[PDB]
Structure formats: structure tokens, C-alpha cells
A paper describes a structure:
Recently, a unique binding site for a cyclic 12-residue peptide was discovered within a cavity formed by the light and heavy chains of the cetuximab Fab domain. Here, multiple crystal structures of meditope peptides incorporating different cyclization strategies bound to the central cavity of the cetuximab Fab domain are presented. Collectively, the structural and kinetic data presented here indicate that small perturbations introduced by different cyclization strategies can significantly affect the affinity of the meditope–Fab complex.
Next, we sought to directly probe the importance of van der Waals interactions. Firstly, we replaced Cys1 with mercaptopropionic acid. We speculate that the increased atomic radius of the S atoms is responsible for the favorable hydrophobic interaction with Val9 and Ile10 of cetuximab Fab. As expected, the affinity decreased with increasing distance between the linker and the Fab (Cys-Cys > MPT-Cys > AHA ≃ β-Ala-β-Ala > Gly-Gly > linear peptide), underscoring the importance of van der Waals interactions in this region.
Author numbering:
A (entry chain A): 1 to 212
B (entry chain B): 1 to 132, 139 to 220
C (entry chain F): 1 to 12
Amino acid sequence: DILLTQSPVILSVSPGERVSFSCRASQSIGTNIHWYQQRTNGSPRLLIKYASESISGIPSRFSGSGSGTDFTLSINSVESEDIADYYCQQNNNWPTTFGAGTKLELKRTVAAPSVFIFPPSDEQLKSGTASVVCLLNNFYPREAKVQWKVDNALQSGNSQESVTEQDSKDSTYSLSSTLTLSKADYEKHKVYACEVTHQGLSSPVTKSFNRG
Amino acid sequence: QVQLKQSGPGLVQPSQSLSITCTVSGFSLTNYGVHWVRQSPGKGLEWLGVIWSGGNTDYNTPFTSRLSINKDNSKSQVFFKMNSLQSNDTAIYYCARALTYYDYEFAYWGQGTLVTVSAASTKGPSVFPLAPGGTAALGCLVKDYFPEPVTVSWNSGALTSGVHTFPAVLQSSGLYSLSSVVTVPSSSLGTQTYICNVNHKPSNTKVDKRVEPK
Amino acid sequence: XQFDLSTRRLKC
Ligand SMILES: *[C@@H]1O[C@H](CO)[C@@H](O)[C@H](O)[C@H]1NC(C)=O
């Protein structure tokens, strides 16, 4: 089968900038290449067919060139809604094969997180488990530290983080940190604190509550 | 419009078979081919096979033995079946239609069916509330379900601005957990109702959780 | 990068 090599793996640019994706084929495939966009939780969307032919409904800022083994998808002025992965596909040789894709990331100005903390619901406590959630909302860039403390004791190993993909509108991330305790441990302690460290804060921000 | 609507996401036991139905509209199955493509961590996008207007089938080489594609033109339905799944067959499966009847440029896709190959049992989630400069945050903790995915929306789709639904994470228990938040004006907590609509299709668990200030 | 089933996005 034809191997398709896309590069780079990650592309980082700023809005309004031109950007280019590369796709190299393991042997000449003429102009038989198609390009796709995939957004968070999406199916692939066809952007360009046969190297350069345009697609109805696709913003004119998308174009492609190339022939033989070296192909290029271009975005002339990058928008925030372009945050996505991009894939090439060859169909000169059966079977049709796809590249491994390029991830597009957008730089923006530093944005401090808004921090919210949520104690476990009494409904969940009936089940014998306590989840304490800490929310870091709409920040940039992605690096952040969440540190949990219960009654001045540092928590380690009992929390998990999930981070959204980049927002398609404001280009920020959001993060949740969930501290999971047994109901017994939770009932034994009082002060639940989450300390958040990020580049957009001049000092760390703590949100906390006292059980009851 | 041209559309492809696939059957719901679900568990398949190791060495059992996977079955997906693609129902199409805005075109006739007698005029177009329907292709099947999958998307896995280990191999990315692979083309699997196709059934043509006239009923002929082509299967990609690694799948000739275990793949079968059928259809019912009158019902606008395409039937995908794959035998003896192993764990690296866990993937997102898609049906798709080309721009022209004989070609392979996929302009129309189904929403994809997330397929999990595992010997585990299906389990619906519990839903718990995450209770709330004039901006309040509130949400839903969607906990202890298998397999992926859950859909979550807010106020039956009417609330979308400010909504963040986090990627699910696998707990040590082997069950997933996820939170969905939204930010709103705190002055609106008095007058608006907030409900997260949780849907876990693999277990047919549908919950609407009202989230109030405690 | 690698495709992530939860988000359908590449993840490094
Ligand atoms: C799964 O395993 C088989 C046998 O090791 C291999 O041929 C195939 O490439 C694997 N599939 C994926 C999607 O990684």
C-alpha cells in the first residue's frame, strides 16, 4: 500500500497567519489526494479533492497544491474555528490510504483560569464515595498545576485531570481536577482546598470549603 | 440534504461479531456506493470496504475473511458485519458516501459508531450535581459507566454557550467518569432552571439532573 | 500524535 507521511505532527500558529500542511507519498500518486478536517468529536469533513479542486461550502481560505509525491494544504488566514486535525488520503492506488494527520494549535494571549470548587453532593455521599471537583475555566496556555490539600495534608495519587480541546471561539482550555475519597475519609476531615498555579496568575489561587 | 445515520455505540465481547446499520436519506442506494472506514488509536483511518450500487462488494485485504457488507435498497439501509473482534478492533466506525458513484472522495459521513471490544459488563452512570463577578459555575458529575460514550446536553439543547463537557477518564475501577460544566449569570439562578440531559445509549440510561444552588 | 477515541482528536 501507499504510505502517506504527514508533517509536522503538531503545528502551532497565531490567528491571521498563513499555515501549510504537508503530505508525502511513498511513490508518485499524480494528483490523486484528498484532504480532510476533523473537529473535536466530529467525523471527517472533506476540504479539497484531487490536490487542488475546491469543495462546495468550504471557506475559500482553504486551498491545496502539489503533484507526484509532495502535497500541501494551505490556510491563508487562520481562524480559531480551524482548530482541528488534518488528514490526507491517496486514491491513485488500491486500497485508498490515509495519512496519520497533523494537529493544528492556535497561540493566543495568556488568560488566567477562573477557579471554582464543588463539594460532593449529599446524593453521592449516600453511595459511600465522595468526589470533590475543581474547575479551571477558560485559560491559556494549557500548562497548569492543581494541588489538593485536606486539613493541610497534601493529597497525592487520589485525583484525576481532564482537559478540553481548544475552544473553537476563544482558543482557551478548561480543566477539571477530581479528588476521590471514601465517604469515611471525607467525613473524618474538614478543610478541602485546591490550589491552582498558572502563568496568568501572579500568585497561586486557592478555592476551598469546610465540610458543612 | 444527503445524510447517513448509523446505529448506536456499544460493547462487543472478544471474538464476537460487530453489526452496524447505516440508514441513508437524500439519495438512493441504487445510485451510490456506500463505503466503510474506521478510526483506531493503533492505525488511524483505514478504509475497510464498500458495497456498490449494483450490490458488488470490495473488502480491504486484511478484512476479506471476516468482513461482510449487505444492503436493502428499498429500506435505504446498509448492513455492516465483522467477525471475531479482538481488542485492537476497538475503533470509531463510519459509513460514508463519495461525491460521485464510482469514486472515493468522501464528502458525506455518518456520525460514527464507537465500538468497544471488552469482556466487561455494560453499566449505566449515576448523575450527581455540581452545585453553584456575577458569573456562577454549575454542572453534572457523570460517574461510573461502561463503556464510552455518554452524551450530555443542557436544557434540552437550548443552553450551549459556556458549556464544557470534559473528556471521559478511566478510573482504576475500570469504569469511566466525566463532568460537564456551564457558566451562567448568578442572577439567573433565581429564575432559570438548569438541567443536564445525560444519555448513555449502551445501557439505555437516560437521566435529566436538575442542578440547584445548595 | 495518536488518535483518541474519547475526543476523536490526536493526542500527544
Ligand atoms: C491487531 O493485531 C493484529 C495481530 O497482531 C495486527 O495485524 C493488526 O495490525 C492489529 N490491528 C490494529 C488496528 O492495530
